[PDB]
Amino acid sequence: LLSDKNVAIIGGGPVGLTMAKLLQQNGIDVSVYERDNDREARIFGGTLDLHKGSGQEAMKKAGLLQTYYDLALPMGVNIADEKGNILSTKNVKPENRFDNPEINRNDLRAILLNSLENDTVIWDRKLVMLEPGKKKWTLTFENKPSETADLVILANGGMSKVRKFVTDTEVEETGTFNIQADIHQPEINCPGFFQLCNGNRLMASHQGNLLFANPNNNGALHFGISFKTPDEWTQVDFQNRNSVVDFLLKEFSDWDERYKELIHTTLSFVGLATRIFPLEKPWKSKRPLPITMIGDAAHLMPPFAGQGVNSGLVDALILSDNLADGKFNSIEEAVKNYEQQMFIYGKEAQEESTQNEIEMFKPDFTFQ
Ligand SMILES: Cc1cc2nc3c(=O)[nH]c(=O)nc-3n(C[C@H](O)[C@H](O)[C@H](O)COP(=O)(O)OP(=O)(O)OC[C@H]3O[C@@H](n4cnc5c(N)ncnc54)[C@H](O)[C@@H]3O)c2cc1C
Ligand SMILES: CN(C)[C@@H]1C(O)=C(C(N)=O)C(=O)[C@@]2(O)C(O)=C3C(=O)c4c(O)ccc(I)c4C[C@H]3C[C@@H]12
């Protein structure tokens, strides 16, 4: 159905690599073009958890579920207030494979990459421009040779700049903001807080500020602080750690010293306004050649419903299935169908994540 043709996946995240695998195992010629310099580029962020009905199904179809279980770490959850512990949900042994197990992002990438043929991914390729030829797409990469493909799948994340041939829809800010950081040797560097986590994830919310932590992301503590974006904003510089610290100390002044210590020992902070790429409007029905989008390029949504990668890996599964069978008359029909399905579950997820985002920042929120 792609019989004499080649496919170009833009972006080698979890969604794009998985796409690559499901396509490659059906004999389809595919390349992944990835901005990052090489296999070993550190991916910043906390862990991902694949769910039994969605994410795990993609891995299962990929022959990678067991490997995901082997590397993934199930975790409990503690809910704390701006000092003490309010609930402790440890994982029960029949729930430990179950829509739980936390995996590190480099670990996940290493599983996917290893499952692929050699030289499927081409590194150090930043797609800047896309241009429709007669029977093929011409792809322009910063300071590197251009390439052509019959079908482009955009898997290049929520801030993809190369979406115009699918949709004119734009990324939007939702009104909240996130500060993320890693602490190494958390047991040395934030002892008291590491001891509150006690090997579990931790969440606390108080007076509009939400704190989330995972104490064991391959031995690093990853934490996030989220809040309604200030009307003043931006007016904090994420390059000057001092300006961030000062801001967080004002905001967190009521909180226990163990949380303050977290802000104190962090070397480097990443500030990111929550964004949504809303599935508000249908995508373009007239397109010059075959192109589509999966993952966060398709449906970037706030990270508070835990959804995100899961619906992206479902996109992978539905799309590859659709491309394989030759049930459809044309690539263009296969894409249309995938997109129809994705609009439905994607909108579901976006509503869930939006409503949770609203719920959580509602002034008097508590996690139970
Ligand atoms: C702070 C934060 C916390 C999150 N927490 C969770 C969570 O707990 N659970 C969850 O399910 N989701 C979470 N998400 C969402 C989740 O991380 C993403 O949904 C997932 O990584 C999306 O996969 P993706 O591969 O589609 O996008 P990405 O993961 O963003 O992959 C995009 C890839 O494309 C590359 N790329 C970008 N531009 C180009 C280009 N021009 N050319 C070539 N390559 C390019 C990038 O290098 C990257 O490799 C979170 C997101 C954020 C920001
Ligand atoms: C991205 N950032 C806002 C948060 C974060 O920093 C962490 C983390 N552990 O560092 C996370 O754990 C996070 O990625 C994350 O995983 C979250 C969830 O899984 C989640 C959920 O599944 C259902 C309801 C709620 I409500 C949440 C909270 C979300 C918090 C997310």
CA separation for the pair 224, 213 (Å, rounded):
6
Q: How far does the centroid of ligand 2 lie from the alpha carbon of residue 90, in Å? A: 17
- For the chain, the first-to-last Cα distance in angstroms comes to 50
Enumerate the H helices of the chain as residue ranges.
Answer: 14-24, 55-62, 65-71, 105-115, 186-189, 191-197, 241-251, 257-265, 296-299, 309-325, 331-361
Pocket flag, ligand 2, residue 308 (CB < 6 Å): no
Q: How far is CA 248 from CA 215, 229, 233, 273, 336, in A?
A: 20, 13, 15, 16, 46
Q: How far is CA 2 from CA 150, 285, 320, in A?
A: 9, 21, 11
Q: How far does the centroid of ligand 2 lie from the alpha carbon of residue 164, in Å? A: 31
- Is 68 assigned to a binding site? no
Q: How many domains does the chain have?
A: 1
Identify which ligand lies nearest to the alpha carbon of 212. 2
- From the number of C-beta atoms within 10 Å of its C-beta (0-12, 13-18, 19+), residue 57 rates as middle
Range of the domain at 75: 1-368
- Is 33 assigned to a binding site? yes
Q: How many CA atoms lie within 13 A of 232 on its CB side?
A: 5
Q: How far does the centroid of ligand 2 lie from the alpha carbon of residue 248, in Å? A: 19
* Nearest residue by C-alpha to atom 5 in ligand 1: 303
- Is 14 assigned to a binding site? yes
CA separation for the pair 24, 320 (Å, rounded):
9
- From the number of C-beta atoms within 10 Å of its C-beta (0-12, 13-18, 19+), residue 135 rates as exposed
CA separation for the pair 251, 32 (Å, rounded):
43
As given in the structure block, the two tokens for residue 201 are 């994830």
CATH number of the CATH domain containing 50? 3.50.50.60
CA separation for the pair 65, 69 (Å, rounded):
6
Per the entry, the structure determination technique was X-ray
Pocket flag, ligand 1, residue 178 (CB < 6 Å): yes
* Nearest residue by C-alpha to atom 22 in ligand 2: 306
The angstrom resolution of this structure is 2.4
Closest ligand 2 atom number to CA of residue 224 = 6
Instruction: Supply the DSSP symbol for 73.
Output: B
